[PDB]
C-alpha cells in the first residue's frame, strides 16, 4: 500500500495472467491483447529469491546436551538450565515473528514499488501523446496498431513520430 | 540429519522448528509458534 499502485488506483489483478506478475492489456482497432512484462517480473522475483537464500541458510552452530532426559540432573542446576532455555525460547520466538512480519511488509511494498515503476516508465515513454486516466491505464490520443503496442512493450516506441497527430485530440 | 532429539531427527532447511526445545546438534532454533508464513508473492487482489 506504500506507493499507491497495487490495491490502490489499480483496481485489481488479472487471474488470467499466468505468465507474469506484471503485464499489458491493450484495446485498439485490430483487437485486444495481453502479454506479461519480463524485465520487471524478473526484477521482483529476484529480490524475493535473494530474501529466501538469506533465511534458508543453515546455522553451522552445534549444541550438546547439558541436560538429561533419563536420570534428571540435580534440581538447582536443573532449574538454572531450564530457566536459561526458556529465556532463549523467548528471544528466538520474538526474533522469529518480528523477522517474518518485517520481511512481509517489505515484500508487499517491494511489489507495489515495481508496478509503480512499470507505470511511471511507460508514462515516460509516451511523452504527450496520451493521458493518465488513473485506473492504471493510458488513453492513447492517436489510432495505433498491434506493432505499435509491441514497440511500447519492448521499449522502442518513438514519440515524435505520432506527436502532432495525437495533439489536436 | 544433524539435529536429534529423543524421538528422532529434525531434517529441514527452515530457520526454526517447533518440534523439540531439547533437540541437539545443528538445528533450526526452537520457537513457541506452530507456524510463521513468509510471503513470497505480492498483495493478492481479486475482484
Amino acid at each position, epitope marked *: 500500500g506504500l506507493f499507491g499502485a497495487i490495491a490502490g488506483f489499480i483496481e485489481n489483478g488479472w487471474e488470467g495472467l*499466468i*505468465d507474469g506478475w506484471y503485464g499489458f492489456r491493450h484495446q485498439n482497432a485490430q483487437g485486444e491483447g495481453t502479454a506479461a512484462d*519480463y524485465k520487471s517480473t*524478473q526484477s521482483a522475483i529476484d529480490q*524475493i*529469491t535473494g530474501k*529466501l537464500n538469506r533465511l534458508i541458510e543453515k546455522t553451522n552452530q552445534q549444541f550438546e546436551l547439558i541436560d538429561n532426559e533419563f536420570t534428571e540432573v540435580e534440581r538447582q542446576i536443573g532449574n538454572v538450565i531450564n530457566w536459561t532455555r526458556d529465556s532463549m525460547t523467548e528471544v528466538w520466538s520474538y526474533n522469529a515473528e518480528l523477522l517474518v512480519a518485517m520481511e512481509n511488509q517489505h515484500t508487499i511494498d517491494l511489489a507495489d514499488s515495481e508496478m509503480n515503476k512499470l507505470y511511471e516508465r511507460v508514462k515516460r515513454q509516451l511523452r504527450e501523446n496520451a493521458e493518465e486516466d488513473g485506473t492504471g491505464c493510458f488513453e492513447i490520443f492517436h489510432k495505433c496498431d498491434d506493432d505499435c503496442m509491441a514497440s511500447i512493450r519492448n521499449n522502442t516506441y518513438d514519440h515524435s513520430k505520432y506527436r502532432e497527430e495525437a495533439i489536436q485530440n | 540429519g544433524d539435529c536429534y532429539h529423543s524421538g528422532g531427527t529434525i531434517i529441514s532447511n527452515l530457520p526454526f522448528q517447533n518440534i523439540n526445545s531439547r533437540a541437539v546438534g545443528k538445528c533450526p532454533r526452537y520457537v513457541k509458534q506452530e507456524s510463521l508464513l513468509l510471503a*513470497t508473492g505480492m498483495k493478492n487482489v481479486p475482484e
Partner: antibody
Amino acid sequence: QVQLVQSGAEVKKPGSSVKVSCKSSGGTSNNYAISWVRQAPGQGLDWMGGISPIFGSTAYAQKFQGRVTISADIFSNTAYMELNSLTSEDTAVYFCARHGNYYYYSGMDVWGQGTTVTVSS
Amino acid sequence: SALTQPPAVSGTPGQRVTISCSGSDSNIGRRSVNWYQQFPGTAPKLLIYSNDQRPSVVPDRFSGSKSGTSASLAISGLQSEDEAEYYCAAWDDSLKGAVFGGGTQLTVLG
C-alpha cells in the same frame, strides 16, 4: 558462475520409475525456469516440461503429461524430474537446462552434463 | 518434428554454410527462434536466441534470421571445430510446449 550437476546414470527395468536430480551449484537457479529435455539414442532433443519454483509454475509437454512429475526444492537449489511406467522407448540421455529467464520461451543457456537412463529386461 | 531441418550439411574450411528450419504458424510464425550446437556425448550449447541475438561467448561467424514461418542459421568462415549437430527450436502455441527440429549434422569437408 552457476553449474548444473545432475544425478548419475540409472539402470531400470520395465514399468519402474526413475527420479533424476539437477543441482544448481555456485549460486541459485530458483529465479529461473529449468527445463528437462531428453535425447533418445541417435534422435533429436525433446522437451519434457519445466519448473520455475519462485514464480510458481510447472509445465508439461502434452506427450508426457501424466507420466512425468517435475518438481523443485528451493532450499537445496535442486530441480527434479520423475518418469513413471518406463519402457525401452524411454532409454535416453536426460538433460536439465536453465533458461535465460523465469519462463520457458527464452533460450536455454546453462546445461547439465546429462544422465543416462537405460531401460532393459 | 514440428520443426523440420535438413539431416545433413557440409562445407570446406572458410566456406559459408546455412542450415534451414521449416515450421508453421503456431511456432516460428508467431514466436522467437533459438539455435543450439551439440557435440557427441556432450550437452547442447545455446548459439542463437531471439531469432538473431548472439551470446557474448559465441564467435561472430554464427548468425541467425527469421522470415515468415522459417529460420536460418548461417556460419560464415566455417572452422574445423564447427563439426557438430545443430538444432533449431521455438515455443509452439498450439502444443503449449517447447519444440525442436530433428537436427542437422554438419560435416567439415576436405
